[PDB]
Amino acid sequence: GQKVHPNGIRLGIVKPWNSTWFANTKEFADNLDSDFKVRQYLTKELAKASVSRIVIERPAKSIRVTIHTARPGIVIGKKGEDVEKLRKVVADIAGVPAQINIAEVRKPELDAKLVADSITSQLERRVMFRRAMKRAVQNAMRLGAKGIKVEVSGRLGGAEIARTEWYREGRVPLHTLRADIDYNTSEAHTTYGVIGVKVWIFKGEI
RNA sequence: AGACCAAUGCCAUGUACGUCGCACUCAAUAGUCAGUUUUCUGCA
């Protein structure tokens, strides 16, 4: 087990943080756990909506949750009853007056959360993994994407030993720190157990 | 160059490699008949 998380080593360099509140030591743990609850809830209740990121920020006793998603229409719905329902329950969880926004992730096959969730969904619909991976690399390289690597792992095809079998195309410069590597990871709970899907997407060199 | 260095339970090893798709709507040509009599009308 030996590679650094390629989001974490780029946190001040190119990648931003998904939480951008300041807090002293008295409320740092409380704000942090409140963020675990709103991302847990808001991740479970938008499983069909293809959600990429949820960014929390707290401007002066009020949360401001931004849902980067690929299907904004299914998040908002017929006149946005679903949004006001979500800020009602996020205001229930965080205990502050909640705002909520939706940022449309166009080009959803270049986002690693959406790619890993895609391949994970296909693996738990019992399709063969080489199609899922290989289709994901092809259609991601089709639109921009100066590199992509996907990597499934663990008891693939229902075996009794676990393999990995990664694929990559293009250039994925993972030790370069100015590389805009969009990396994310999902787990596929199949009837044989968990299958881990990692995906790195190299977008640009700065 | 050219001292000395002995041995290393029992098994089965594997899953596993067989491939795809697209579409679409605009125009001619119902019905309308007739219209007193003439005439100067700048000039070189």
Short mmCIF file of C-alpha atoms (C1' of nucleotides) in Angstrom, two decimals:
data_model
loop_
_atom_site.label_atom_id
_atom_site.label_comp_id
_atom_site.label_asym_id
_atom_site.label_seq_id
_atom_site.Cartn_x
_atom_site.Cartn_y
_atom_site.Cartn_z
CA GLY A 1 0.00 0.00 0.00
CA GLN A 2 1.95 2.95 -1.15
CA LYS A 3 0.50 5.89 -3.08
CA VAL A 4 -0.51 9.26 -1.68
CA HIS A 5 -4.04 10.39 -2.26
CA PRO A 6 -3.74 12.62 -5.33
CA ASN A 7 -6.30 15.07 -4.08
CA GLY A 8 -4.58 15.55 -0.73
CA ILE A 9 -1.13 16.40 -2.02
CA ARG A 10 -2.67 19.02 -4.32
CA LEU A 11 -4.79 20.79 -1.70
CA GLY A 12 -2.98 24.07 -1.71
CA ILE A 13 -1.46 23.79 -5.14
CA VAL A 14 -4.30 23.39 -7.62
CA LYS A 15 -7.22 21.56 -5.95
CA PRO A 16 -9.50 23.43 -3.52
CA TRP A 17 -11.07 22.20 -0.25
CA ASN A 18 -14.63 20.90 -0.13
CA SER A 19 -15.16 22.68 3.21
CA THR A 20 -14.26 26.37 3.34
CA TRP A 21 -15.29 27.59 6.76
CA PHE A 22 -13.05 29.01 9.45
CA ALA A 23 -13.69 27.93 13.02
CA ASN A 24 -11.86 28.06 16.35
CA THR A 25 -11.16 24.99 18.44
CA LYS A 26 -14.47 25.20 20.34
CA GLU A 27 -16.61 24.46 17.26
CA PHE A 28 -14.18 22.83 14.83
CA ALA A 29 -15.24 19.30 15.73
CA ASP A 30 -18.91 20.28 15.80
CA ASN A 31 -18.81 21.96 12.43
CA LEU A 32 -16.85 19.02 11.07
CA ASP A 33 -19.31 16.39 12.33
CA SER A 34 -22.22 18.50 11.12
CA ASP A 35 -20.52 18.34 7.69
CA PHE A 36 -20.36 14.52 7.96
CA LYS A 37 -24.03 14.44 8.62
CA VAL A 38 -25.01 16.74 5.71
CA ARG A 39 -22.76 14.94 3.24
CA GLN A 40 -23.98 11.57 4.52
CA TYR A 41 -27.65 12.57 4.19
CA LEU A 42 -27.24 14.51 1.01
CA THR A 43 -25.20 11.69 -0.55
CA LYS A 44 -27.76 9.01 0.34
CA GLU A 45 -30.82 11.05 -0.78
CA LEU A 46 -29.33 12.01 -4.15
CA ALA A 47 -28.08 8.53 -5.19
CA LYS A 48 -29.95 8.65 -8.49
CA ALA A 49 -29.05 12.30 -9.19
CA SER A 50 -25.38 11.62 -10.14
CA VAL A 51 -23.84 13.99 -7.59
CA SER A 52 -20.12 14.85 -7.93
CA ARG A 53 -19.20 17.21 -5.06
CA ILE A 54 -20.89 18.85 -2.15
CA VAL A 55 -19.08 21.91 -0.93
CA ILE A 56 -19.84 23.31 2.50
CA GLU A 57 -19.07 26.86 3.57
CA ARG A 58 -20.27 28.72 6.68
CA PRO A 59 -20.61 32.49 6.36
CA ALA A 60 -21.56 33.68 9.88
CA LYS A 61 -23.85 31.09 11.49
CA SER A 62 -25.39 29.77 8.25
CA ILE A 63 -24.50 26.89 5.93
CA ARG A 64 -24.27 27.38 2.12
CA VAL A 65 -24.07 23.80 0.66
CA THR A 66 -23.24 23.65 -3.07
CA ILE A 67 -24.17 20.48 -4.91
CA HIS A 68 -21.99 19.96 -7.97
CA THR A 69 -24.13 17.46 -9.89
CA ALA A 70 -24.53 16.21 -13.47
CA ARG A 71 -28.35 16.15 -13.52
CA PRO A 72 -29.47 19.42 -11.93
CA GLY A 73 -33.04 18.95 -13.12
CA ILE A 74 -33.66 15.84 -11.06
CA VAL A 75 -32.19 17.63 -8.01
CA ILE A 76 -34.43 20.68 -8.47
CA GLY A 77 -37.47 18.90 -9.97
CA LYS A 78 -40.79 20.32 -11.06
CA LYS A 79 -40.81 23.73 -9.43
CA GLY A 80 -38.08 23.32 -6.92
CA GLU A 81 -39.91 21.51 -4.14
CA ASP A 82 -37.00 19.06 -3.82
CA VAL A 83 -34.50 21.84 -3.21
CA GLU A 84 -36.58 23.54 -0.49
CA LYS A 85 -37.19 20.08 1.02
CA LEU A 86 -33.41 19.47 1.07
CA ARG A 87 -32.60 22.82 2.68
CA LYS A 88 -35.32 22.16 5.20
CA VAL A 89 -33.66 18.92 6.31
CA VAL A 90 -30.13 20.36 6.04
CA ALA A 91 -31.35 23.20 8.28
CA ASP A 92 -32.65 20.41 10.56
CA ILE A 93 -29.26 18.69 10.64
CA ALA A 94 -26.80 21.57 10.88
CA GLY A 95 -29.05 23.66 13.19
CA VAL A 96 -28.35 26.87 11.23
CA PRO A 97 -30.49 28.59 8.57
CA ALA A 98 -29.49 26.67 5.44
CA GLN A 99 -28.92 27.84 1.88
CA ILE A 100 -28.37 25.39 -0.93
CA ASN A 101 -27.18 25.76 -4.52
CA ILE A 102 -26.80 23.53 -7.53
CA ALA A 103 -23.82 23.72 -9.89
CA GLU A 104 -24.25 21.80 -13.14
CA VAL A 105 -21.36 19.49 -13.92
CA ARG A 106 -21.46 19.44 -17.71
CA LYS A 107 -19.18 16.84 -19.32
CA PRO A 108 -20.05 14.26 -16.63
CA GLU A 109 -17.73 11.60 -18.06
CA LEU A 110 -14.74 13.74 -17.10
CA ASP A 111 -15.59 13.73 -13.38
CA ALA A 112 -14.04 10.89 -11.41
CA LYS A 113 -16.85 10.62 -8.87
CA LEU A 114 -19.33 10.16 -11.71
CA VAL A 115 -17.09 7.75 -13.57
CA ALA A 116 -16.47 5.59 -10.48
CA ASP A 117 -20.14 5.70 -9.57
CA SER A 118 -20.94 4.72 -13.19
CA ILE A 119 -18.60 1.74 -13.26
CA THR A 120 -19.77 0.77 -9.74
CA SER A 121 -23.46 0.87 -10.86
CA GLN A 122 -22.63 -1.28 -13.88
CA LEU A 123 -20.74 -3.77 -11.74
CA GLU A 124 -23.71 -4.14 -9.40
CA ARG A 125 -25.97 -4.62 -12.42
CA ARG A 126 -23.73 -7.68 -13.13
CA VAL A 127 -22.03 -6.56 -16.36
CA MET A 128 -18.50 -7.64 -17.20
CA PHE A 129 -15.88 -5.32 -15.85
CA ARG A 130 -13.74 -5.00 -18.95
CA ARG A 131 -16.66 -3.38 -20.79
CA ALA A 132 -17.32 -0.94 -17.96
CA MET A 133 -13.70 0.09 -17.55
CA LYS A 134 -12.87 0.14 -21.24
CA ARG A 135 -16.02 2.10 -22.20
CA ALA A 136 -15.24 4.56 -19.40
CA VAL A 137 -11.70 5.15 -20.65
CA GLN A 138 -12.84 5.49 -24.28
CA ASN A 139 -15.67 7.95 -23.69
CA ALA A 140 -13.61 9.93 -21.20
CA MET A 141 -10.61 10.26 -23.60
CA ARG A 142 -13.14 11.21 -26.32
CA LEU A 143 -13.82 14.62 -24.71
CA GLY A 144 -10.59 16.35 -23.68
CA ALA A 145 -8.99 14.29 -20.90
CA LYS A 146 -5.27 14.37 -21.47
CA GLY A 147 -5.13 11.15 -19.47
CA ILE A 148 -7.31 8.70 -17.60
CA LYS A 149 -6.59 5.61 -15.54
CA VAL A 150 -9.32 3.39 -14.07
CA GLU A 151 -8.58 0.59 -11.64
CA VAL A 152 -11.08 -1.92 -10.40
CA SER A 153 -9.99 -4.49 -7.87
CA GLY A 154 -11.18 -7.39 -5.86
CA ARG A 155 -12.86 -10.62 -6.75
CA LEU A 156 -13.85 -9.49 -10.23
CA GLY A 157 -16.38 -11.65 -12.09
CA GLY A 158 -17.08 -13.56 -8.90
CA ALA A 159 -13.79 -15.34 -8.57
CA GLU A 160 -12.24 -16.99 -5.51
CA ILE A 161 -9.02 -14.98 -5.80
CA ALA A 162 -8.92 -11.21 -6.15
CA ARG A 163 -7.20 -9.41 -9.01
CA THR A 164 -6.89 -5.77 -10.04
CA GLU A 165 -6.70 -5.19 -13.73
CA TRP A 166 -6.28 -1.48 -14.31
CA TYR A 167 -6.44 0.35 -17.64
CA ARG A 168 -5.08 3.68 -18.74
CA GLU A 169 -4.89 5.86 -21.77
CA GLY A 170 -3.02 9.09 -22.36
CA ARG A 171 -0.76 10.76 -19.84
CA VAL A 172 -1.51 10.65 -16.05
CA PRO A 173 1.42 12.50 -14.43
CA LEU A 174 0.77 11.63 -10.84
CA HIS A 175 4.00 12.79 -9.21
CA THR A 176 3.68 16.18 -10.95
CA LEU A 177 2.04 18.52 -8.44
CA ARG A 178 0.75 21.08 -10.87
CA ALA A 179 -1.14 18.38 -12.74
CA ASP A 180 -4.93 18.82 -12.45
CA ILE A 181 -5.62 15.19 -11.53
CA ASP A 182 -9.26 14.61 -10.68
CA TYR A 183 -9.20 11.43 -8.63
CA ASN A 184 -12.07 9.67 -6.96
CA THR A 185 -13.09 6.27 -5.72
CA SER A 186 -16.20 4.16 -5.23
CA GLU A 187 -17.13 0.75 -3.86
CA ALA A 188 -19.43 -1.77 -5.56
CA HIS A 189 -21.25 -3.99 -3.10
CA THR A 190 -21.89 -7.04 -5.27
CA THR A 191 -23.18 -10.43 -4.25
CA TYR A 192 -19.57 -11.60 -4.07
CA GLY A 193 -18.45 -8.70 -1.85
CA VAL A 194 -16.90 -5.31 -2.41
CA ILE A 195 -15.20 -4.33 -5.64
CA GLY A 196 -13.10 -1.20 -5.43
CA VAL A 197 -13.11 1.24 -8.29
CA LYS A 198 -10.55 4.03 -8.42
CA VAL A 199 -10.35 6.52 -11.28
CA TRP A 200 -7.76 9.24 -12.02
CA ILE A 201 -8.54 11.80 -14.71
CA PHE A 202 -5.74 14.08 -15.89
CA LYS A 203 -7.21 17.27 -17.28
CA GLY A 204 -4.37 19.77 -17.65
CA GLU A 205 -0.87 20.68 -16.55
CA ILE A 206 -1.74 23.78 -14.40
"C1'" A B 1 46.41 -16.88 -8.54
"C1'" G B 2 45.44 -21.24 -5.19
"C1'" A B 3 41.99 -21.28 3.46
"C1'" C B 4 37.74 -23.20 4.81
"C1'" C B 5 30.77 -22.79 3.48
"C1'" A B 6 27.13 -28.90 5.47
"C1'" A B 7 21.64 -28.90 5.01
"C1'" U B 8 16.92 -26.40 3.63
"C1'" G B 9 8.73 -31.15 6.62
"C1'" C B 10 4.35 -32.30 3.16
"C1'" C B 11 0.80 -30.82 -0.70
"C1'" A B 12 -3.07 -28.21 -4.69
"C1'" U B 13 -1.32 -23.37 -6.88
"C1'" G B 14 -5.41 -20.67 -9.26
"C1'" U B 15 -9.81 -17.39 -11.58
"C1'" A B 16 -9.16 -15.88 -16.62
"C1'" C B 17 -10.72 -14.05 -20.62
"C1'" G B 18 -16.30 -15.51 -25.47
"C1'" U B 19 -18.47 -8.77 -27.43
"C1'" C B 20 -23.22 -3.88 -29.92
"C1'" G B 21 -27.29 0.51 -31.57
"C1'" C B 22 -30.31 5.20 -34.18
"C1'" A B 23 -34.53 8.53 -35.95
"C1'" C B 24 -38.13 12.45 -37.84
"C1'" U B 25 -43.30 17.49 -40.78
"C1'" C B 26 -43.74 22.78 -46.41
"C1'" A B 27 -47.67 24.90 -51.88
"C1'" A B 28 -51.95 26.23 -56.96
"C1'" U B 29 -56.97 26.28 -59.41
"C1'" A B 30 -64.67 30.83 -56.81
"C1'" G B 31 -66.80 34.43 -59.29
"C1'" U B 32 -65.52 40.88 -61.97
"C1'" C B 33 -70.19 42.68 -67.41
"C1'" A B 34 -69.85 47.75 -69.53
"C1'" G B 35 -67.51 52.74 -69.72
"C1'" U B 36 -72.48 59.39 -75.18
"C1'" U B 37 -70.01 62.60 -79.20
"C1'" U B 38 -65.95 65.79 -80.93
"C1'" U B 39 -61.58 69.13 -80.61
"C1'" C B 40 -57.66 73.44 -80.53
"C1'" U B 41 -53.59 71.83 -77.70
"C1'" G B 42 -46.00 76.74 -77.65
"C1'" C B 43 -42.32 76.02 -82.11
"C1'" A B 44 -38.01 77.29 -85.27
#
